[PDB]
Amino acid sequence: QHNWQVGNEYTYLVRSRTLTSLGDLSDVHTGILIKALLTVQAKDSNVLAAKVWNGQYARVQQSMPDGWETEISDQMLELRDLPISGKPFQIRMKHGLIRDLIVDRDVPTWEVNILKSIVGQLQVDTQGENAVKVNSVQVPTDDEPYASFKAMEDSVGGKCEVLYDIAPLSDFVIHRSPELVPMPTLKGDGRHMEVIKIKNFDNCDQRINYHFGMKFFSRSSTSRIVISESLKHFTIQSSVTTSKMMVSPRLYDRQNGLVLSRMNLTLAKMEKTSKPLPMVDNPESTGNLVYIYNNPFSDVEERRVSKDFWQPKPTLEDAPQNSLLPNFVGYKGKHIGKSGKVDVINAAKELIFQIANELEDASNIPVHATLEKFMILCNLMRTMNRKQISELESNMQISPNELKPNDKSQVIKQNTWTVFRDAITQTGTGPAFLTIKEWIERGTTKSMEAANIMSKLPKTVRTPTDSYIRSFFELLQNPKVSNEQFLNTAATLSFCEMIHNAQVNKRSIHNNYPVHTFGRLTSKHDNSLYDEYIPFLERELRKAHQEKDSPRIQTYIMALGMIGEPKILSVFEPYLEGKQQMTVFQRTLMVGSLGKLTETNPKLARSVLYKIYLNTMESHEVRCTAVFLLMKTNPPLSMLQRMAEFTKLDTNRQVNSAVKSTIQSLMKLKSPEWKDLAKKARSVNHLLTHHEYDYELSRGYIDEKILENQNIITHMILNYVGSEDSVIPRILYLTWYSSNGDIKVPSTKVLAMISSVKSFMELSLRSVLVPLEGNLMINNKYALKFFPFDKHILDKLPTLISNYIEAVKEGKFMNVNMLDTYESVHSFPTETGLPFVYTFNVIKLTKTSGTVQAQINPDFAFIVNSNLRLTFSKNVQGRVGFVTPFEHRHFISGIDSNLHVYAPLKISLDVNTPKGNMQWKIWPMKGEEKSRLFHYSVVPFVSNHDILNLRPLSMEKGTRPMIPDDNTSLALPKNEGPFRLNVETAKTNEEMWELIDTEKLTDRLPYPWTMDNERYVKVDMYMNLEGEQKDPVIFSTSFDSKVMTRPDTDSENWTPKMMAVEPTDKQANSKTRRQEMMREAGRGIESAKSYVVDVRVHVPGESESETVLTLAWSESNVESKGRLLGFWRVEMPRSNADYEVCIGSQIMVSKMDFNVDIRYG
């Protein structure tokens, strides 16, 4: 109860430290230490006077072999003053506990947070004031040092549950450690005690964190407090806290990233007061001991303190207000642009110009670190308002309508436009969306560029509010978007995806957006959805159905499907029942669009899908979809039992094959997710039919790849619906997961459909009832795309091809660039009072540049002289660390990786229609004789840099890569050759990397996927003098008329044994390929017209390898199939290897084909 006495002055020693490290990889730590003093005076019953006055801190980047808890003498540290004002403040007490603090208004919020952390260690609850219904058991106690209750205490990390335990202190411990009891004469007639607190962060009331994504963290807070005489009238002697955070840097590693912290107080003096502390000027309450936010863009301090501790909802003109990320609280708790050394507009301009200039020298992209610059730019523009964006756009003089993209002189301008467009697409704020809206309104972006812009918005928006969606709706109503067919689909799908992820799915609402910083994004009282949006889509669907336009119907069906609200069932009801006519493809799309309803409302979705299944009058491509969808809802045992029993009397082969394959393949699933369903499938197996179906029928299939060593499970779900006319199935479902622990990366799913394969084949052959309909969908982490098509687009395609051919006659220049990013941030305060930041980034690039000119002739000579460049890069960054606002510094431990592919090449295709000769030529271009073609490095590091400097970390003097002591280097090409390969791996014992590079073992696997992906590697594949090559790499391909002989077809014996035609194909010549063409086509010719495709791949130079190939067969319904073809003979002109592997298949059964494996020489 009475922790303190009136008229006494307590002096405490303050010690703390916060460090980051790479874990078991290295023993190098980066961080800071703090030393200070705390003075507390008890002047009244519930009024305390406090002051923290001495302040010193130092930065450490060392190796700590013994441990992070070791003492470091002041003679080994460079100490600096801590910019905190030693202004007195007041602590208000209630029932022996800390209630709130009173601080002068002219004090920064970060200082208030540090004081919260310091004072939170004086909070001892011995009488169970924060009762958790366990203090009643402790009530009948009298002089009992033992107590093991539970409570709910206050700390900078939040207001979370804490476990208590009290027991007396023995004299042996005190003798070993005099540090615990500085002055021991204060116990008087009592005894010493120990209090241990263990903090649980799972269940908790007040939470403060920032999130954006789509449990790997590990928090552990413990305390150790020693108190003097009595459990009611005592004195605090020492208090220490210890916290630890563990993160896997790249989501698939062994949890190596650490952040550690501690706070320390030891009593120094206690004596009667002589001079009192001055009263607090300009008082104001700071709430409880929990972290508080700030206004980043305000000139004066503005604290949101509960008495709702929540930042205001983002608007559509001003920047969002966050208080846990480096760009918002780095500069003394305020915005970075307030520094003066940083002007946002000029920084953005310089970064854009640098990125645009560096894209011309693509072979040096990894060296210059362009993609890291792109990420820095995207981070920087999230702190801009619309006025600043408009000023920047006007200042860079961008007018793509005026600019000519086809001119080689104007390349940097187009690159600036491209980089700026990509950066705004990835910004994700309100001003960015206003900028995009203004662009589309005026006409700066028209069809495909705008469709690409809209395709990425749902995957990059961070704060989807009501105003954001209202503006999106207003944009959807625009004449320009509505009239264009391609832009409309992208815009509508993105709108519906955002609606769903922001309002419908509670899991999406809570676990994907920073709710604990801004509150719930959309108020539950907003009836805008049901009164405005869904009726609009219903009207549009009705109009589209009336006019009989396939792509519009498909777009609105997908749009209503992706919402996932139960009202879409009433929306779809008139079409499903049969009052309104609809085709089978459209009905299948409607039934498959119900996927997100199964995730959110499993019972109702199960009811409707089972009702669809039980009907025997629906087409099989409806019921198969119903089966494939039901098993995503975890049915009960009776359901599966009845479904399995149904197979005996069911009269459809497709449905039975679907259910049997799904149930049988649902057995081997020994995973934490499908365990119960696997057991149910095992229990029901003994009732399925004994009939077996061919692989051409509809079948589902699930792959489980469980790896105990890697602790990662990879899944693979494949559903396809067979057809009664062609072997190729009509509909294909494909999905890839990647689960490690509990967190999963967003999945990649592909959907392909077509109404009739025979119709598609007939249209394809003609170019050289049920309408032709089809669509393709790719939904991955980067964008959502949907291409629906009808017969009109198929008939328009040849016109576009002819127009392109006639337009590239004189010569055309092309410049296509593409940039994509992926983000995931997680931030929360530590137990010292400082932000903790975790980031995971991926950046991609696909650049295709060069001049292309063609020619077409009445002789059908499609003569082309192409000249291209090809590039692909990928950067992956994973970082963990913390920020110190009082010096704008950021401490990072992480691993970065790179991958780079460059394809400088020149092509001359001379394909002739009358005679199937398509002779290519591949050259190295002039001035590019020596160039880099490959790069792959993985680099772990510890960094200590300044936020005001917007530069890649590789150029910062504080960064330190982890180079092993015994690093070595290898140059694989033994002597002079065409190719140069370097490996700069280290430790001479990685084995998995220096064995795949041996290139002398035949059994060695060339695949490098199976390797340790956490080590310093660096590989470069250069090229020395392959250029200036007059001799080309001939790639000549011939063709055959595919004739057949009737006498040989009749009375032709069929045997499983396969003969070898190698002696007949001894001559490896394209001209001699005509001689061998008759033998290959003639063999096994039973009313079949099969041609031969012979390629003569020839490589000139010092080493020549005349690789040859032959595919001579075709698929015919009348024929018995079985392809006899294939031989790869490689001859060295100097030392002939004569590697001549051959294959073949003459089974002629339509069931095992006998294939010869190899034959050497």
Ligand SMILES: *[C@@H]1O[C@H](CO)[C@@H](O[C@@H]2O[C@H](CO)[C@@H](O[C@@H]3O[C@H](CO[C@H]4O[C@H](CO)[C@@H](O)[C@H](O)[C@@H]4O)[C@@H](O)[C@H](O[C@H]4O[C@H](CO)[C@@H](O)[C@H](O)[C@@H]4O)[C@@H]3O)[C@H](O)[C@H]2NC(C)=O)[C@H](O)[C@H]1NC(C)=O
């Ligand atoms: C919370 O913070 C407080 C201080 O803010 C820490 O208290 C300190 O704890 C350390 C370690 O327990 C103490 O260090 C020990 O000091 C002893 C006395 O130092 C000298 O004192 C005088 C000079 O003033 C000399 O005349 C005398 O002869 C002593 O030499 C040392 O004897 C101890 O030596 C230990 O280390 C050496 C070298 O490794 C070994 O050879 C020894 O065998 C022995 O293990 C030791 O250095 C320090 O005194 C404490 N400070 C105070 C003010 O009491 C708490 O430890 C901290 N809490 C946590 C959890 O870290």
